Every structure is written in structure tokens, then in C-alpha cells.
A paper describes a structure:
Caseinolytic proteases are large oligomeric assemblies responsible for maintaining protein homeostasis in bacteria and in so doing influence a wide range of biological processes. The functional assembly involves three chaperones together with the oligomeric caseinolytic protease catalytic subunit P (ClpP). This protease represents a potential target for therapeutic intervention in pathogenic bacteria.
One crystal form reveals a compressed state of the ClpP tetradecamer and two forms an open state. A comparison of the two types of structure infers that differences at the enzyme active site result from a conformational change involving a highly localized disorder‐order transition of a β‐strand α‐helix combination.
Residue numbers in the entry:
A (entry chain B), K (entry chain B): 6 to 12, 19 to 130, 143 to 195
B (entry chain C): 6 to 11, 16 to 130, 142 to 195
C (entry chain A), J (entry chain A): 6 to 130, 140 to 195
D (entry chain G), I (entry chain G): 5 to 12, 19 to 132, 142 to 196
E (entry chain F), H (entry chain F): 6 to 12, 20 to 130, 142 to 194
F (entry chain E): 7 to 12, 21 to 131, 143 to 196
G (entry chain D): 6 to 11, 21 to 131, 143 to 195
């Protein structure tokens, strides 16, 4: 179902990749997470000083995979600007939240959710790290995050901006 | 995979032919795969030319709200005006994407079915998303919210004629 | 679907999938379960990169929960005996054969991103005997070699499901550096 | 669909390594996987009858008729076929490994080599005198008497690379570089 | 999966350039029709050069398979047959119907003339035609062929050479 | 399965006015309990029913039919939790007769009711909170607070909370 | 599976003229009710039947065979509700003896019936609304409006609507 | 399938007459609830005679399984435990929670205190309670129990006797 | 559902033969099939602790923990358990057969007896010292040294009834009446 | 569903399924594929009938295409070593183990109905060897014994799928009488 | 779905079996054929001189199984009267045809078909025996049967009586 473009033959995502556009669409997992990392590493290699535009529509997924992407965004040289174009739940909100400071966006009707669900024992811990990371990027107190996450504090686009997950709603 | 000149194969198919003329299809269920495709095509057509109008032909029974509203917003906030043409069925998110078309360019073919009811899809309180939908359906149609809220409650069915008078479309292509 | 990159290289205006493009930088990926299919893709790529140059480093990005011990052994062995240093970089998970593959990288060139998780549990995974699992001792020596750890320590922690964050794996000796910029 | 690929449908890593006369057997030997090896071995022979072939083997074995086809093709064609074990060579896998050119049969050190060949072979009764050509072939390449081969092919014996060198199944164990 | 050659050709396409065709796996309309297409194609390219038909099959459909046999027969170029692995049922017939003096097997192959079930009962005078075909090409008495087909006679490369199913075993 | 006289094991225990709810609360399982409660009412309406509960809950519709049937029959329905009382199980356990609700010490009790069970028609949610509050001796304000999160409880806390009256620690 | 008395638990409650519709109304579930109603009528034609309902409804054809069997038999069919009554469950609840239709407070009654159960021949849906209008006491144009709408009603509202006589609270 | 006795009793029913109960296979609501029913039934028949609880289980659900443990504890009669085959996870706990001096194993059985995954992360202070239970009944230090549970400590009948999981090995 | 049955749910042929203290193991040893034997062995013990039990075995084996449960139950209970092989006794099947009362272990003459015990046993590593109690048990009942048992339990050796008598796995081969 | 027969027998007014009722006349049935489940029902019944009387004949009605060789061997062996003569009667098919079971009946008491079909093909049907199929020789001797036929004749005709009508099986020695009234 | 009767508890077929009524319903196979043989053997044993009523509604099935039943009907002492109560195709017609001379019936609307379909090679032969058996019971020439069977000569109840498959149509 994916169309093709010229300028050479290109699928549409591949064409949009040339303009430094990366997509995450649907659930985060070893396949979808590793392809984002692959595109990010590639775009850094082409130009280490040009911004990348990371469009996110995700109900989240695996934490190991998602944190792989999150780390990669922080530690590549380029600024990864994050746009939410539908949803950003679970790891979707964290990857959104972890975009480059001042370049985190959402469309108005999207739904940002910050609760990280179920998907060895003392090992969470990981959850503490997700709260500490969300607190850095939003600026909230760690306590505020810990109270707000073990509860699916659902938020519209304007509510997420107040909370510090994104920087700008796109009304234009 | 359609009639192909020469999934992610190497070919120039019918949809790739018509994308060169800025035409875009939503055919079938709205979901993460299908919605992201529209949004990808809309972003692509904008970077090619930000002034030329896009022709977004729609035949959907609806589906996911989050993904659907993601398309709606993209239609609104890209510079190019998006024309909408209903070519069979426009229910739930189909009707909202249709009705969300640029002012003056919201078409439907004579026999099409527009249905404006929207079904569900922790939480319960969280479905004030239904109020965001009702505002936007009122904003584009021109109807009152007390009408839109009540009228978008029951499974209301419209032929193209009724969808013009209601305000979901601006014309009906008899010529 | 996998994205596609078009380039030139004094040879032609060539077209690569995103992974083949990164293979030009000597970047191989192991992503997901270690089985025959995925272990031979890795091994294939390592041989290809050696055939192109046996001295330039290889950067092996690992995000695996593990899998087959024989298939992973092939990869581990391939990493040791091709001429170029295989630098390993963990970008999510490295459990079981994955943590052996991560720890089997060149001295001083094993990395992990900060949020990655590493487990050194070596689970049970045609017909052959229990005493014939002296494959288990080889894993434990391979790990004890590469970590700098006492063999008794590796035997104690491998039948324990002992989970570690990135920096803890640094402490234990599974990696050399966590990546912080 | 296929895996790390250049295009101009696509030119995968196995193809790229076939330009270098490198061939794999990965997973169980069957009609599909065995004919692929046979077709590569024939193609490589026709490109250049004199340059060597490098056959990297990771297999639990499988079909005897299919595998014997591969085995036979390796002796038939003009090129020396070097064999390298890169994980498992079991049953037909061990036979194919052991059937590489004299002095050019390698194994990685962690590899497991199992000469036991189990049922099914495919109608089947005493006409599993296929089992006797198996053992003659295995005897010829190893230098073992036919007694020991029959003894050891009917018991599930497991060898690491060094026992496999000792036994004659392979000439070298890659312990370096 | 099938590797590719650049000069993008799949490996069987590239071997087709050298007039080499394969029957691998079960004989059925699809696989039989494929072999027929290749034999047709190669003749139109050159009707005077041999074709090399490598066979690893356990047989299968009689109609489909006899279609392949008939095409081998009635095309101009000699079709030389080489067994690599198994030749059972319609595989052993197709092996045995290669050009005279040009039927081969590699020495570890297994050849089986028995042909099972794969209409009416009286319409297995198709069975009679197969046994004639096998008799003609082997040199054997029809009585011998009919004995050895109802029995599941299993032959190695040497036995098949002695029976007349193939002309040479090659090393 | 198992059988006895002085009848499966569950039928035998139904003579001693004992009823089990075991596993998911659905139209099948709810109705058997309702049917058992009704039968026990007609057999002797003064005497007490002992209702054992080990369930992660299920349907609200099916579950509340059991709740009502406990209240609006003659007998006191004494509840005991013997493993798990989640979702509707918490409520059915909480809805036993006044002063007659028990739990075994290792039991886990969870008042949260998940979405399974459209829109504002989830005012049912307020009837649950009210039903709980009324039986718990706890304010609608904290009851809604706790049912909006995955709030686990041991038998000790459940008693202090109000959900049960006695934790069995003896004979 | 199901317990035993002295009979199985449902048969023993049939000894006291109690009948259950549990889960979906279909050929199988509806015919069991229909056979139980006939049996109770043959045991004593005057005594009241008690018909507990917990259903999301289902097949219109089968569910209307049982609704007719309630009217056609002599015994007054008391309909009690114990959790849910949607689609045919709403109709079978309403179709009980006037003076003897009951519910429990937490129950959820829904008059809406789905699509699944010739096109013009679904004039059957207009018979449905007539029969509801007859048992409720409402005008027909109120019923056709309300059905087609997902209008959820709890026991106190269902009393006001005419769908039921009482609400049990003791 | 289960044979029948006439005196039609199934064989487990007939052994119930001699106060013998089985946990065979995985511990889950169904199987756990069954065991609880039998322990309840046998006490009402006679609260002063021992019960003989034969255990061949690899464990399973913690909630369900602790329900069985608690019932064994708090009923009047001693529940003597006998391991025939396997006692892993909730099986080894249930074995170990039998009456003091009356916990048995046949000499070839395999006993494993390790308990895996089968809510929230903080709600595995259930893990703490299990390790207390195991510590209490074994006589071991909680530190030892916690070491040996996170490890997959596999014990034979003799080792389990030495550890205090059982009181006797019998021949 | 069940098979040739009297009623007064039903009284099948296995029940009718259980009145005669005859017990079967039919098909693979698992938690369901093994506990059935254990429950019968216990029931027969409780009916009458002194009269013998006749255990007719047709099994490819299966689960070691489950089967050892059966094995142990046979030694535990008071009654002599006679074992009769009626087709296959393999792995756990051969162990159960061999674990019958001294002098009361029979086999029909066409039966196949295979002492090879394969994986899976069930987490599993050196804790397959279950394998060492297997061999001690097999050694005790047969009279074979532990060497020979370890040698022969790890190779797929097949015995007809007369080799099984010779080896000590059974005391008698039913050649009459 | 299986029909049910009610009777009396100085014991009670008992109730049998149709097969248990015929078991009172010492009639056992093997119907369909020989496997572990069906071979033990047969063997169970044979032991039961012997336990009731070891001298009264048993009438074993066979309609099977065959199946497992070990399971059928059990039945064949059970037929030889219980004290009462097992008369066999073929009522449809007897192929493979079924024809061995039919032919394994008591001397002079093996029957078939006229329209029955008998094949003596012994097909291939945990892990063990090819030479270990000297089970095949035992079948061939068991058949050569019971048929009166030369062992070479049985070896020739068993790998041939040699089909026979009832009266042909009489000629070959597989049965004694065809039933004609 | 099968009801129960008194006089003792009885399923309906079991009750009807006491009046010497046997049923074959649906496809002929090892299960359904062996149960008819079992009932026939049983009814002979109860009374060897009382007729048995064999009601047949069958599309036929396996020939080995069906010929097992056919033989049993001929060689038990009782006369097996055969009634067709719906269909009697393939082996259904042969079992119908092979009822006791003068006691073979059909209801008027039933459909008798005499073609034996597909379900080693020279082995048919069996088919020759089916034609010879059908010729005995009907009285037709063997040639007539051989021509008429390798063709699905379909027949109503009155046409079957003319042909000799049954003796009487039941119009009363």
C-alpha cells in the first residue's frame, strides 16, 4: 500500500528520509525501534549538524527497545525534533518528551499519556529511571512524576505543553 | 502491487501515478498504517509544492480516533488546501476527515453514504475526546453543538444530498 | 518495510536499504532473537566486512534477548577470529547469548547506551546428553575470560537471572564504557 | 523480501558473498536448502572451474537423499570445496563438513560436531543400505575403519572441534587471527 | 533464499544461460509446467545444443509429469538427464527418458521405479503406458518392469546403471 | 469431578450452605451462584449461607446481579476470600452480611474495577463506589481515589480499610 | 459445570417454576426456555412462572418464538431481571405479566436491538417497536426514537419508561 | 481415563473416603479450589483425623496456591504432605507447609523452592511473604531462603529433608 | 465418554479389570497418565494391602519426574507389583517394567524394550543427576554394574524380550499357554 | 452415541452398551486403526474374558486397516498366550497388522465374511535404528507360521501391497473358512 | 440432542432397538458400519427367528465397511427388512437392495442412487462384485447393472421398485 516517487525510484518514507524525516508508527518493538535507530545513525552520518524531524504516533511498547531509541536521540550529535501526529502513550510520550529542547511539538487533537504499563522483580528500578528521565525533560519534581505515572494521567496537546512534555502546539 | 509500471517493491503503480498529480486515497479502515500513509503523502506533496491543492479521495468506514484525528490535524495545518471527495463510504473518522476538507472543496459522488456517528477507541473520563470531535464537526459543518452532539449520538445515515444540506460537503458531483 | 538510501561511490549511483547503507561504515546489527537465520546474517556480514578490509574496526550493534547457543557460538567465534576488532554497542537489551556477544567484543571497545539492560542468564536452549552440556563450561570460561571475573563468580551469577543496568555491566566487566554524550 | 540488500529484485549479503565464492548451508538440510547449495556449487563451477569454494556450514542435518546430493555435487565439480563449521554440523551437516577438500576442512572452536544420523531417511527397510554408503563416505574422508564409523554413527556422540580434528572429520580448528 | 548475480539474475536464471534446468521437489502442474517452459525456451534459443536436466524429485502427478517427458522427447535438442539425490516415481521415469547415452547419476543417488496413486480404475492403462516407456528406455522386459514397479524396488546409482535406467555413473 | 455421599464435592458442600465463586465472573459463573443462592433461600430462609470467593473479577453486569441477589434474599451471606478477590470479587466479598465478612491471611484483595465490564453510561462506576462506600464505611472521596489505580491489599489492610470484618488466624 | 440436589440446580429451581435465560438468545438458548415454559404449563396451568433474565439479547427469530410462548400459555410469566437485559432481553423483560415484571437495582436495561438477528422484510423491526410500545405504554414514535438510540437505563428509569413494573429492594 | 469403583465412584472419590487428596499438575484457580473443597469437606466429616495430601506439581498461580496453603493451616485436622514426583514453586511450598513431623517424600522426587512470575512490582512483597512461609516451616534463615529461591536450587528427597522442607524420606 | 461399559457414570473394562487388581499404563507417561497409575496403586493398596497387583505396560515413556513417581509408588506400597510388557517399554516404560517385584517381571515375546532415556527430563544442567538415580535404580533391579547401565542408557539400544531377560530387566518371557 | 441394552443375570437388572453386551458372548471388536488406545482395549477385553473362563472360545471381529506394529504385536501376542482359542472373523478390511491379527487366530477357526479384503503389506510405522527392524523378520515368520507358507513367499508378498478377496486369503492360508450361510 | 425414555432409562435408539429397529444415518464408515453389525449380531442372539427392521438414510461411504454390514445381513439367521427413509446412495442403495426378499421398502420422496464413487489398481474387481451383488437382489442382467452404475442412474422410490432395488413403496 506504500506509493513510489521519483527524485530515481523511492518509496515515500525513503523520500521523506532524504529531508531528515523519521517515522515511528504503531507499537514500539525490536523491529520498529531498531529501524528508527538505523535512520538516526544514518542521518547523523550524512550530516552531523542538521536537525532531524521525528514524527511519533505510538501506543508505546517494549521499554528496552524504546529506551534504545531514546538514548540514541540524546547521544547522536543532531537535534532530534519530535512531532506527535496522533498519539504518544507509554514509550511514545517518553520519546516525544526526549526530543531536543525547544523542538518538541504536537498537533492539537493528539493524546499524550505518561503511564508506563506492565509490558525479574526488584528490577523496576527501570521505572525509577523512566521517571527520572521524564522529570529532566519536563522539569517536574521526581515526586510529581512518580505520583502522576502510576496513574494514567491522560493529557490533550495543550495540557502536555503546560506539563513540559512538548514545547509548542501546532495551530498553523 | 497494483497495475505497475517500472509492499515496498521497485515499481510505479497506479497510486504512485496519481500521487504525481497530487491525488491521494484513503481506502478502507483508518488505523496506524493507513493514517500515517495519508500524513506521509500530505507532507510529501507539501514539500514538492506548498501552493497547489491536494485531492484527498476518501472511502473509509472509519476506525481509530487517535490516528484519524492525526490526519485531520495534518490536513488543517499544512499550507496546501486539501479537497475531499467521498467515493463510496464515509463513516466515523471518514466523515470527519471528509467534513474536515478545505472550505468550498468538500465533494461527494451521488451514491455515497456519509455516516457521522463515532464509536469507541484507560479510561472513562478520558472520553471528552468526544467533545473535541463534536466541536470540530460543528466548526466545519456550521451546525450548533447541541445539534451535533445529539445528531452524532444515534447512527445517522446520509446520502450525499442530505450531507450537503447538513454541511458535511459543499457540492455533489452530478456533472 | 525498510527505508532505502540512494548514493554514489565511483562505481555507480547505487541504491541500498538502510542497513546495507550503514554496512558501508562497518555497522552490523543483531536485532531480536538469536537463531540460525539471524546468526548467519550477522556472520555473513562480518565475513563480508573482513573481505573488504581486515584491519578497520567493526561496530556491532546488539539488541537481543538471546536464543540458540550453537548459533550464537558461531557469531561469538566469528567475532574472535576475523582479523578486525568487533566493537560491540548494546542499544536496548542484551540477555543470554546477547550478553555473551556484547561481552565478546574487542578489549576496551565494548559499549552500552545508558538505559540498556544486561542479563547473564544462560538458559537451556537433534538429540544429545546432559553431560554433553560442557558447552555450559565454555560459556562460563568465555565470560570469565572477557569480564576479568573469577570462574566461580560467573558460575554463581549465570544460574541466577542476575539483571544489570548499563553502568553495572561496566562494573562487572561485561562492557568497558557507558556512552554519555 | 530479503536481507541486507543493494538493488540494481535485490542483491543481498549472500549474493555479495557469492561473488567471493562463499556459500552457506544454514539450518536443516531439505529439498529447498540442499538444491540452493547444489545450484550455487554449479554456478560457481561454471563462472570459474579452478578457483576454490568456501562452504560455511551451520546445520542440524535433515534429509539424507537431499544432503547426499550436496555431498556428491562437492566431489563432482572441479573446484576444491573448503568446509568451515560455524556452529553445528550434525548428521548430514557433519558429513558435508567432513566431505570438504583434503586438508581444507575447518571448524570454529565452540562448534558441536555430531556424526549420528537418525531416522527418517525418507519404502524403507533393508533399503537403508544408504546407511552403508554414509559410513563408507565418512570412513574415506576421516581415515577411520568402517567398524568405528558404524559404532559411532549409531550412538549420539558429540564432539567439540578438537575431538573432530582427532577423529579425522576436519583437518583444522581455527584458533587464531 | 535464492542468491542473485549481476552482469539482477537469480541463480537458476543464470544457469539457464548455460542450458541447465532443474526439477527439484514434487512433480505437479506448477513445477512440471516450469520445466516445460524452460525446455521450450532453450530450443527456440538454439535447437542443436544439448540441455542438462538435473533431477532431484520423489515424483508426483502423472499427467503433469508425462507432459514433461513428452516435451523432452519431441523437442529437437537432446535432453541429458543427471540425478542428484533422489529419482522416484515420475522422477525415475524422467531420468530414464533422457537422450540415449546421456543419462547420468551421481554415485550416492537413490532411484525408484515404483509409481503410486498420484478418473477411473480402467484409466490406469496409463500404468501400462508408463511401464512401456520405462521398458523401452531401460531395455528391460515389460514383465520385469511390471514386477519391479508393484514392488518398491530401490536402486543405487550402480544398480540403476545395470538396469538401464541410466547410461553412466559419474564421479 | 470428585464424588461422595454423606453429588460432586461442590454439590455436597451446597448441603452445608457453602457456595464457591472460583475464577472469572461471567454470565455462566454468576448465574450458578445466583441459582445456588436462590435454592438455599427456598430450602431454609432463616439460616446462613457461606459464600467462598477466589476470583479476579469479570463482568459488571453479571457481577452486580450476584451482588443484588446476596442483599435481597432472606439469608445472611457470609463471605470468605480464599486466594484472590479482585474487581467484582472485592465487591462481592465487601457485600457479605454485616459483621460476617472474612479472609484467609495470605489473600490479596484489589478494589480497582477495570474497563472490561459507552461514555457517561459508565455512571455504573458511581453505583459501585457508593455500594463499596456503604459497605466499607469509607467516603466516596477516597473510594474513587483508590479505584482509579491498581491498589492491592493484604487481609490486614483490607480489614482496616473496611472490606472485611475478620482475618482468620486460628482454628 | 453445574451442581446437584437430592435433579441439577436449574432443574430443582424448575421444581419451583423458575426459569433462566442466561447469556445470548439464540436457537439453542431460546428453545430451552420455550420447552421449560411448555412443561411448567403442563404441570400447573394457573400458577405463576418466574423467568429470570440476564442477556445481551441476540437472535430476533428465536427470541420472538419465546416472547410468543409467554403470551400464548395460560400461566402468568413473571419476568425478573438479574444483571443485563439488552435487545431481546429488553423485550422478554417487558413482555411479562402486567403486575409481575421485576428487576434488581444494579441491573442495566437497553431497548436497542442490533442489525444481526430480505431488506423490506425487516419490517420485523416495526413489529418489535409496536410490541414494546404496547408493553411499556409509550407512543410508538417514542420507541423507534429510543431504540435506534443507545439509551442505557437503570432499574429506576426502566420503571418510569414502562419497561418494568417494580424494582426489588428486599 | 479414571477407573470406577462400585460399592459408581471414580478412583479419586474412593480415595477421598480414606481422607486422601491430590494436587496433580499445574496449580491454578480450578485445581486449587478443588483441593480447598476437599480439605473443607474432610474436616466437616471429621475434624480430628489426619488428611494425606499427595503432591505432584510444578507450581503455578501464587494467589490460588496460597489459598490452598492457608486452608491447610487454619483447618482443624493435620494435613500430612507426601511428594510423589515433583514439588516445584507452589508445590514445594505446599509440601513444606504440611503438619510438623508429618511431611514426606518418596526417595526419587524432585523438590525446587524457586518461584517464578506466575498488579505491580511493589506487590511482590508477596515474594517476601512466601520466603517467610518457607523460612518458618524449613527452619532456615530468610537470607538462605532468598538466596536459594532466586537461584534455581534443585533438591532430591534427602537434600529436602536436610533443608527442612520435609521431615522424612520413606521407602 | 468411555469404552466397553456396564452402567450402575459407567463401569468400563479398565474398572472391571481393576476389581481383579489389574492396572495398565498405555501410551506416554505424563502427569495425567502417571497419577492414574499412582491413584490405582494406592486404591488397590487400601482395598487389600496383601494381594498382588498386575501392571500391564505399553509405553514409549515420557516424563521422568512423573514416571519416577510411579516407580516410587510401586516400591512404597505394601503389595507386590508384577510387571508385564505388552508391546513397548521404552525409557520410563522400561524402568517401570524393570522395577516390578523380584521374580515377577514378564514380557510378551514380540515386545521391544529400550532402556535409553532421552531429553527432555522437565532449570536443567548438572541437576540432571536425576540421570544418576535412574541408573542406580536400573542397576539395582537388573543386577548390572552401574558402568554398563550408564553405557547402555545413553545409547539407543533395543532389546527383544530374550535380551531383556538376559540383561536382568525382566525375569520371564511368556512363551506359553 | 452407542446403543444401550438392559438385561438380567442372577446378579441384577444390569445395563450394558451394545459392545459390553456382546462381550458376554465372548465377542471382542477391533474396529479401525490399530494404535495404543485401541490395542489396549482389545488386550484388556481378552484378559477379562480369560479371567471369566480360560477354555471357552473368544470371537474376535476384525475390521482394521492396521497401524502401530508394537501395539498390534501386543494384541497378537495376547491372542497366542491366553488359554482360550481366539477365533478371528474379518468383517470388512484386514490390512497390515489387521491381517496379522486375523491370521494369528486359532488353527481352523479363522473366518472372513465373503466381501472382505485382506492386504499383507507391512509398512514403516522414540528414536531407533534400521537394522533394529528385525521386527520385520518376526512379522514374516509369524505370518509364515500361521499361513503354512514358505518364508521366502511371505518376504516376496509383504513388500508388494498384495490385495486379496476373502476366498483368496483362504487359498493363501491367512484364513480357514469363508462364511456362506 | 437425543431424548430419554422409561421402559428403566433408555436413549430413543436404544428403546427402538428393543423392538428390533436398527438405524444407519449419514455416512458409512468404520464407526457407523461396526455399530450396525453390533446391533445385528445382538438382535440375532436375542431371537434368531424374529425379523429386524433396518432403517437407512445414507449417502454411502466406504465399501469395505458397507460390505461388512451387507454380508452380516445375508449371513445372520434373521430376515433384515430394509426401509429407506430419506436417501440411499452409493453403499446406501446396496444395503437397501440387500434386504430380505419381499421386505425392502422406501418412503415415496426418497432418492435411491446406485453409482459407487471413487471413495491398489486392478483390485476393482471389488466393483465387479458390487455389480454381481446388485444383479442378484434386483434380478437385472449383470450387463444392465454395469452400464447403469458407471453412470449415476438416479431414481425416485417408484423407479427403484420397477428396477428391483426395493419391493414396496409405503403410501399408507
Amino acid at each position: 500500500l506504500v506509493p513510489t516517487v521519483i527524485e530515481r525510484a523511492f518509496d515515500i518514507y525513503s523520500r521523506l528520509l532524504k529531508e531528515r524525516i523519521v517515522f515511528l508508527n504503531g507499537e514500539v518493538n525490536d523491529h520498529s525501534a531498531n529501524l528508527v535507530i538505523a535512520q538516526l545513525l544514518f542521518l547523523e552520518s550524512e550530516d552531523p549538524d542538521k536537525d532531524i524531524y521525528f514524527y511519533i504516533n505510538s501506543p508505546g511498547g517494549m521499554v528496552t527497545a524504546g529506551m534504545g531509541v531514546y538514548d540514541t536521540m540524546q547521544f547522536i550529535k543532531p537535534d532530534v525534533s519530535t512531532i506527535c501526529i496522533g498519539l504518544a502513550a507509554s514509550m511514545g510520550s517518553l520519546l516525544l518528551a526526549g526530543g531536543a529542547k525547544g523542538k518538541r511539538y504536537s498537533l492539537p487533537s493528539s493524546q499524550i499519556m505518561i503511564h508506563q504499563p506492565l509490558g525479574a522483580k526488584n528490577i523496576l528500578r527501570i521505572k525509577d529511571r523512566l521517571n527520572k528521565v521524564l522529570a529532566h525533560h519536563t522539569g517536574q519534581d521526581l515526586e510529581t512524576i512518580v505520583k502522576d505515572t502510576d496513574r494514567d494521567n491522560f493529557m490533550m496537546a495543550d495540557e502536555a505543553k503546560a506539563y513540559g512534555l512538548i514545547d509548542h502546539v501546532i495551530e498553523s
